[PDB]
Amino acid sequence: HHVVRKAVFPVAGMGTRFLPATKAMPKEMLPVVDKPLIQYAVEEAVAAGITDLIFVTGRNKRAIEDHFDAAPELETDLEAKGKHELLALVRDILPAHVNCLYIRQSAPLGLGHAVLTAAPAVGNEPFAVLLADDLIDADTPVLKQLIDVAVARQGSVLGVQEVPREDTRKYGIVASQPVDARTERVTHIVEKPAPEQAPTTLAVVGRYVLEAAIFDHLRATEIQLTDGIAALLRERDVYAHRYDGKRYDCGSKAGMFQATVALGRKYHGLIPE
Amino acid sequence: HVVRKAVFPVAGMGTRFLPATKAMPKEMLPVVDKPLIQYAVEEAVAAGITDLIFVTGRNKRAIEDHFDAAPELETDLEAKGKHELLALVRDILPAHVNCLYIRQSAPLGLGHAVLTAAPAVGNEPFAVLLADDLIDADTPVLKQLIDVAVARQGSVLGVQEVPREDTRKYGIVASQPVDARTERVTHIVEKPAPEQAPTTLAVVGRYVLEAAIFDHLRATTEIQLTDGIAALLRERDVYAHRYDGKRYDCGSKAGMFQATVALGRKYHGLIPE
């Protein structure tokens, strides 16, 4: 019995490429049109059945906290002005059946450290990890696609997608063997290979379903999550799944700009002049 | 006339931009990598302003933490030897510039926000800048207005022509020319019907006002700045100046989107696919 009801969001991104805008908010609070990156990822997790949100914070923690915690003053004012559609929007930022908690990472030691910071909230349960910088627009929530594989095959699951071989130095790359048309069993993982030397072109994106056994492997190990997963491979089953969906890499100014263009068009009718 | 103080109303609810403005005011949303308010502050400083006055509302934190020094970030950036970034962070509030923060008591409009600043301004002429009006100009627009204010010894409103169909969006000045760019204001009307608009000359969010305006905003019953200016016209000279520069009205999602596209292209080389 796999049940995945907890998700971890590292939201301490320095976003140096986005300074000065990230002086007073973490990178994951920058909006795409009218919505912070992190809220797209939370909405995906909630659509996939997550009920427990775990935010790993750094500096400017209160931009995250004040975004997801209730703000009675705003709700009371909007009610008075009879702006009920707006009130509903504000209240859906954190739906009623969902809870959130906040944990401070001790220092910016990488994703693996951020994930390990969450162990006191996760316990001995499988959990999701979502990197809000990977904004994914999909007909079916990508985390749901990963969770259903995790439950069916009883193992951890990495979201992956094919990338051009020329780009593999940007990514963690999985060496894997097929088990069905979209799912593969991971045997090795390599961080930022030279393109000529990449074992495959199947890259890890910022969506994970991980068994709690990963925590012990990150305590032995900036601590890289890939190190934990590589160590986990020796004890437990790890799968990679080619999700259906369009990923916007908002870690760069250009990628974030194209997300604004594309999603502004699709969900807001905004068109460049 | 010496104009060294500028007032920035930064309590914008930005209901049109919820949920992104849940935890930050509208003026903290970025255009590419820079909050709207920082563009306006940089213009004010380039125009010789040394005293910044921020009128805050809820989420005052986002503004304060953006402009107040962040020692932790500077020390970390120093360690990383990212010296161009460190200088960038330090330039958010230059060394010759100071800022103070005042809370508006309630969201009673621009006229109330301006009156809120009176204890910091005293009896001297001062600038007002609305960061939602993002202006890209070869010479700072506030400087263009200040030089007219000093030369003609009066208050100055920044103005531009708008389509007659749009006059319902704006305060509209009825004025007579004094030269090719400067006009003597005789009447002002808020949001006229297009068929009844006296002109198509609209006020933009850049003002240089004599301190005599404060007394006229204390009589006003949402207190509208337009009402204060209209009342000021009976006692003092008020001019309007056709500034050189391109204004982006970021008060709508569409307007803000086109600012991102346009400034993304010009200053960052970003092109929509």
Automatic annotation (TrEMBL), chain A:
Residues 11-261 form the Nucleotidyl transferase domain. Its EC number is 2.7.7.9. The keyword Electron transport does not apply. GO terms for molecular function: UTP:glucose-1-phosphate uridylyltransferase activity. It catalyses: alpha-D-glucose 1-phosphate + UTP + H(+) = UDP-alpha-D-glucose + diphosphate. It is an enzyme of class 2 (transferase). Keywords: Nucleotidyltransferase, Transferase. GO terms for biological process: UDP-alpha-D-glucose metabolic process. InterPro entries: GalU_uridylyltTrfase_bac/arc, NTP_transferase_dom, Nucleotide-diphossugar_trans. NCBIfam families: galU (TIGR01099). Belongs to the UDPGP type 2 family. This is UTP--glucose-1-phosphate uridylyltransferase. The lineage of its organism: Bacteria, Pseudomonadati, Pseudomonadota, Betaproteobacteria, Burkholderiales.
